[PDB]
């Protein structure tokens, strides 16, 4: 009932050993799907923010007036604990702001995840019908690598060992 | 009035178990009186209830025989320490408003008080019949309230301020 | 209108016989007696806040020095305003005069109706405007008593109620 | 005006993800009356946590017998606790008679005879605006009173304690995971 | 109804430059604006006006700046005064407000809180005070205008201005 909608593979087709969807409706897996995909969007983000603050790369300048910079922001949880107290109510509410109003779909969209709304576009429409499920597939896998890399990322900065050469 | 069922709410609704209604002449005769009691008697217990609670004007009732507000009782007692030209005159505006402005003679008991949105009654005849049972029920309760205050001074020999001291 | 401020135990009295007769300025007359009952209305209340010493904190006009706590409370309280402050009061009253709430228009209806709404029921209405009508009339009465009582006794109504003088005999 | 359409507003519309609404439509009113009801009390719930944490306290004695002052109960978790237990009897009679008499929980529909401050909306979208406006308070009050009593506890003061220590940034702190 | 909102006397329609009829279609959102000018003018004048009767909190903005409630200065350059924090917090809340409970983006300005949480049934009344609303708007504009301009040019703030007795420009 739920074979080969985007999360079907190769390796593995339809995978769902806990059988979570199994019964075949069609609004929780548009639910989870879309909850699967900004989990892999953010953490498909979150990968590469924190293997190049890992790497040492700051953004020049300095992050507050204060005095502190950057470069005084430490690596991985610790940074949250160095961010200045009004930049880190700034980029809460910044996500917040995004999640209210921009990160949404107003105005229909094909397929769940799609944000378009028609304002910003790269030329999707130019993509074949095979090469939109293509895309749409990398995409989701990406998510879903990411999602498991950033879990490994942050329990090993918990533990003492680190999988960062 | 009657026809209304005013005064009759839950749990006990027509509740005459003596018999007292006979025709509908006697029951406009027991409404008025039960009315203006109520009315009376919710005054009595708003005063009852400023007088234990300390709020007393500051200055003297009668400069002439140095008597201040704060040295009248608390208690049943308060008025008749009142000196009499004082009590004259409370009588006097009482039976000027009870011959002339909401004459005791009216057993409707409507003297034309509307407080505009609050008695949007031509389009909520439900907010009236709530009024005219909530008036008449707190009158009932006042009544009890005020006998009961009256029995407490009258058994213990100290008022309500110092009773629940 | 003709019926408004007909109330017991008088009715309608006209004791010197000016509806019948010239009716036709009824409308202006009723529309100065109105205004003058909120204008007598706003004295009396004015005049009971002034006796209770309900006054601002600070300077009616530092130029000269003035408080208004040295503004008396009496009749003499209008004249204690500096020549300035009267014309401020005039111009003012001539824009919400002649401009806003014209004393013109003689029915009163500037529509701000009572508390900012219409009363619905006519019936409620006419009871309130025979109420507005004869608060006027008592308070046009109790201003011109309370102003011939302290020029009178040359004592504000605090004083009076201070020194005891309350029964002239 | 009814029932099945108030509570679902912009921007979630009809919010239901666990589709209720389709496979248990006989329950809905119970569940839409418990959801008022629990909006309503969570609506007190914080008003009362703002008056305390303010210290809008009473003058005297709550309980003289116990030497308890009203400034002696807390204004966190255990000020409920703190009362002496003839008075949380009182309370809890007095609420009883309340919901059983006056206000009767079994009044599903929510309508016990008062209005919005007395007075029926004869509007229909100015009335469902305003049950819309209710369901919405009581929902954002509900969260409001759990994230209030999950964060004294965690944080183990009361709100005027964490206020006054600056304890706002929960991730700078050396308390918790973060 | 809207076309003849904002039409009072002595002026009734004023419109010296036109635009009436020049623009017809642009009407609706020029409105829009001119009414949201006048709430935001007239919160801005009774603010000022609270600022200069010294009307302010007990206590401390930012307790971890030392900035008290009575350390902003009264004028125009209080705005300055909040911190990054606190602007951020304005910023956030009333862009949740002014794009979500009350959008800018309708043009009539009805959100559904009517006048004191009532609608106006009779419609000369809602009429009267609508214009009431567009009026005050329009001189707590022009008001709000005049403070600041006042303000910058004498250099203190409307408090200093009446207290030294800076009134009279001669
Ligand atoms: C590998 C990861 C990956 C992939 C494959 C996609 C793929 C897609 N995303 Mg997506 N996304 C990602 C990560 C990814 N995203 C992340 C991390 C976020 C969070 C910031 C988002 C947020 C996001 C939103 C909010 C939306 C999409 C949408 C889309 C689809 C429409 C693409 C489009 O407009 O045509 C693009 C057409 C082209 C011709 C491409 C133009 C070439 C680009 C602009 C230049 C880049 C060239 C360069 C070599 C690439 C560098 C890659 C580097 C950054 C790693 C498409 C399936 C939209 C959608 O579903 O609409 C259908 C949509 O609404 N995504
Ligand atoms: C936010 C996380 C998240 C969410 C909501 C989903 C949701 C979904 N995934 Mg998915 N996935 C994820 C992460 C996630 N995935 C990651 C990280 C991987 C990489 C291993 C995959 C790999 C994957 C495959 C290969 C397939 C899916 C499929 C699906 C869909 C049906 C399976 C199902 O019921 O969910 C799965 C169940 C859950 C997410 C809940 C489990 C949570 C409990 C608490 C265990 C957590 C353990 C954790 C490791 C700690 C559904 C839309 C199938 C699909 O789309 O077919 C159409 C499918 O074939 N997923
Ligand atoms: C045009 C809008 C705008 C403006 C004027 C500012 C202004 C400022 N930001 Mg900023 N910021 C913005 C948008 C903006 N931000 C957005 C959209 C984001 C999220 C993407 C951020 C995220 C951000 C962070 C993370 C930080 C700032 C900080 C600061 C302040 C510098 C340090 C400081 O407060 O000195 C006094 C400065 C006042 C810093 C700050 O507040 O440090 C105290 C800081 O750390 N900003
Ligand atoms: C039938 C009811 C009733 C009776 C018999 C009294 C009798 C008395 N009151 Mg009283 N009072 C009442 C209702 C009543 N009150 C209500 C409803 C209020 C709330 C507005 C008050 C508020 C009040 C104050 C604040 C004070 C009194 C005081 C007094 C005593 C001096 C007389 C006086 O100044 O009256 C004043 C009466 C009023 C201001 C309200 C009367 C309104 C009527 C009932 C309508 C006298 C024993 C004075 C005193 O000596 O206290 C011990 C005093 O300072 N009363
Ligand atoms: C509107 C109703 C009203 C009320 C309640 C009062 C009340 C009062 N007047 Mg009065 N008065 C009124 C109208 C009123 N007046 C009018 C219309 C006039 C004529 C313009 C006067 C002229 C007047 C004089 C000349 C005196 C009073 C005085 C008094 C006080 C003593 C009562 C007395 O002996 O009268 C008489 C008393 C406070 C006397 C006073 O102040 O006591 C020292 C006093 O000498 N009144
Ligand atoms: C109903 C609304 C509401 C509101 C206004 C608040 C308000 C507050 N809560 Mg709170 N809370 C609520 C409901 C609410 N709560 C509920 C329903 C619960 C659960 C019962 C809690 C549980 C809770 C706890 C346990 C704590 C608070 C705390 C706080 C305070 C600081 C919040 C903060 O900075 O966290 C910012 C967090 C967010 C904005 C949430 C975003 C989380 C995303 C999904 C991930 C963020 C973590 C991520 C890994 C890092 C990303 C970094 C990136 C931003 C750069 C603040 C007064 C904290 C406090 O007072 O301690 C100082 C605290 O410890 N709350
Ligand atoms: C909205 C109506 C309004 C009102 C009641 C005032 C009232 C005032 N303005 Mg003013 N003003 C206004 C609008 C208003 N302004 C506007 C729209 C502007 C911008 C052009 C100005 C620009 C302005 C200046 C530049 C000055 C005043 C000044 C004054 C004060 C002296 C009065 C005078 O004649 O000086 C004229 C007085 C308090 C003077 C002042 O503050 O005292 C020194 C002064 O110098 N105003
Ligand atoms: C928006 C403004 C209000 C924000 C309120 C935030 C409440 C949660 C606080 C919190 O999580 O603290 C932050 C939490 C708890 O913070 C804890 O603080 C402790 C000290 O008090 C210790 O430091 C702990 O280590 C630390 O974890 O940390 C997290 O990592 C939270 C993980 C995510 C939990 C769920 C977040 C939900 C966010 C709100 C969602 C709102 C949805 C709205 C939808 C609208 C749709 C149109
Ligand atoms: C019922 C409501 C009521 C009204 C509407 C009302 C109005 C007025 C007016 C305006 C028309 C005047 C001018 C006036 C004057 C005085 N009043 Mg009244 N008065 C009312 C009630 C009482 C009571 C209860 C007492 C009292 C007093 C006095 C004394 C003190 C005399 C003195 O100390 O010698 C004086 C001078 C006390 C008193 O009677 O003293 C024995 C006192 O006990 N009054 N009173
Ligand atoms: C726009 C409306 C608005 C809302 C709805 C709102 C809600 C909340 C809530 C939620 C219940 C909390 C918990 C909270 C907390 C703090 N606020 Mg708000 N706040 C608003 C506005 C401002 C402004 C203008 C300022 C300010 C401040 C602070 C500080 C001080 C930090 C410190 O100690 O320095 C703290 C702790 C000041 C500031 O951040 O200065 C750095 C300051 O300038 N806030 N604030
Ligand atoms: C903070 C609390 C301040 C005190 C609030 C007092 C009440 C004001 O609250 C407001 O009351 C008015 C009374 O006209 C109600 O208004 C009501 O008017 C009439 C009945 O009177 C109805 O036809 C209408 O549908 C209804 O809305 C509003 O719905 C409510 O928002």
Not at chain 2, 34 to 50: D, I, N, P, Y
Not at chain 3, 19 to 37: D, I, N, Q
């Amino acid at each position: 009932a739920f074979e080969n909608e985007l999360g079907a593979q190769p390796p593995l087709g339809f995978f769902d050993p806990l059988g979570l969807v199994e019964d075949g409706n069609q609004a929780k897996f548009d639910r989870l799907r879309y909850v699967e995909l900004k989990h892999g969007r953010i953490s498909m983000l979150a990968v590469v923010g924190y293997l190049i603050e890992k790497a040492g790369i700051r953004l020049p300048g300095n992050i507050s007036y204060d005095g502190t910079s950057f470069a005084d922001i430490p690596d991985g949880f610790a940074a949250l604990s160095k961010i200045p107290d009004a930049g880190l109510f700034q980029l809460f509410a910044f996500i917040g702001f995004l999640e209210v109003f921009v990160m949404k779909d107003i105005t229909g969209g094909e397929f769940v995840g799609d944000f378009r709304n028609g304002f910003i576009d790269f030329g999707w429409d130019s993509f074949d019908e095979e090469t939109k499920l293509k895309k749409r597939a990398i995409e989701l896998n990406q998510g879903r690598a990411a999602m498991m890399g950033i879990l490994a990322l942050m329990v090993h900065e918990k533990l003492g060992v680190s999988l960062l050469p | 009035e009657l026809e209304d069922g005013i005064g009759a709410v839950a749990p006990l609704g027509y509740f005459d178990p003596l018999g007292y209604i006979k025709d509908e002449e006697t029951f406009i005769r027991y409404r008025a009186v039960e009315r203006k009691h109520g009315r009376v008697a919710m005054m009595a217990m708003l005063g009852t209830f400023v007088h234990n609670n300390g709020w007393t004007f500051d200055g003297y009732l009668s400069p002439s025989q140095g008597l201040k507000f704060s040295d009248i009782d608390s208690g049943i007692g308060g008025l008749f320490q009142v000196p009499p030209a004082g009590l004259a005159q409370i009588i006097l505006l009482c039976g000027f408003v009870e011959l002339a402005w909401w004459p005791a003679s009216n057993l409707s008991g409507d003297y034309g008080v509307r407080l505009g949105t609050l008695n949007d009654w031509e389009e909520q005849p439900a907010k009236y019949y709530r009024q005219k049972n909530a008036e008449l029920n707190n009158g009932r309760a006042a009544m009890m309230g005020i006998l009961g205050t009256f029995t407490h001074e009258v058994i213990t020999g100290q008022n309500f301020a110092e009773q629940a001291a | 209108e003709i019926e408004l401020g007909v109330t017991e135990p008088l009715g309608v009295y006209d004791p010197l016989g000016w509806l019948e007769s010239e009716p036709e300025a009824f409308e202006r007359r009723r529309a100065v007696e109105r205004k003058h009952g909120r204008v007598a209305m706003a004295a009396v209340v004015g005049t009971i806040v002034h006796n209770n010493h309900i006054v601002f904190d600070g300077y009616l006009s530092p130029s000269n020095n003035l408080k208004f706590s040295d503004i008396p409370t009496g009749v003499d309280g209008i004249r204690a305003i500096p020549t300035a402050g009267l014309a401020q009061i005039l111009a003012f009253f001539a824009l919400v005069e002649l401009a806003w709430m014209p004393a013109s228009k003689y029915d009163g209806d500037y529509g701000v109706g009572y508390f900012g709404t219409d009363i619905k029921d006519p019936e409620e209405k006419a009871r309130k405007l025979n109420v507005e009508l004869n608060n006027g009339r008592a308070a046009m009465m109790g201003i011109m008593g309370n102003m011939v009582a302290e020029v009178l006794t040359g004592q504000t109504m605090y004083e009076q109620y201070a020194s005891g003088h309350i029964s002239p005999f | 005006v009814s029932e099945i359409e108030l509570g679902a507003t912009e921007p979630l519309g009809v919010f239901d993800p666990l589709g209720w609404l389709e496979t248990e439509p006989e329950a809905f009113e119970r569940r839409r009356a418990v959801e008022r009801k629990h909006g309503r009390v969570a609506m007190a719930a914080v008003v009362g946590t703002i008056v305390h944490n303010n210290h809008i306290v009473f003058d005297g004695y709550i309980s003289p017998s116990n030497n308890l002052k009203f400034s002696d109960i807390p204004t966190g978790i255990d000020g409920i606790f703190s009362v002496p237990t003839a008075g949380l009897a009182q309370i809890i009679a007095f609420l009883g008679f309340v919901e059983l008499a006056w206000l009767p929980a079994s009044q599903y529909d929510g309508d016990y005879g008062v209005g919005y401050f007395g007075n029926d909306i004869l509007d229909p979208e100015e009335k469902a605006r305003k049950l819309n406006a209710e369901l919405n308070n009581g929902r954002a009050a509900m969260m409001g009173i759990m994230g209030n009593m999950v964060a004294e506890k965690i944080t183990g003061q009361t709100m005027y304690e964490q206020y006054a220590a600056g304890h706002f940034n929960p991730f700078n702190d050396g308390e918790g995971f973060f």
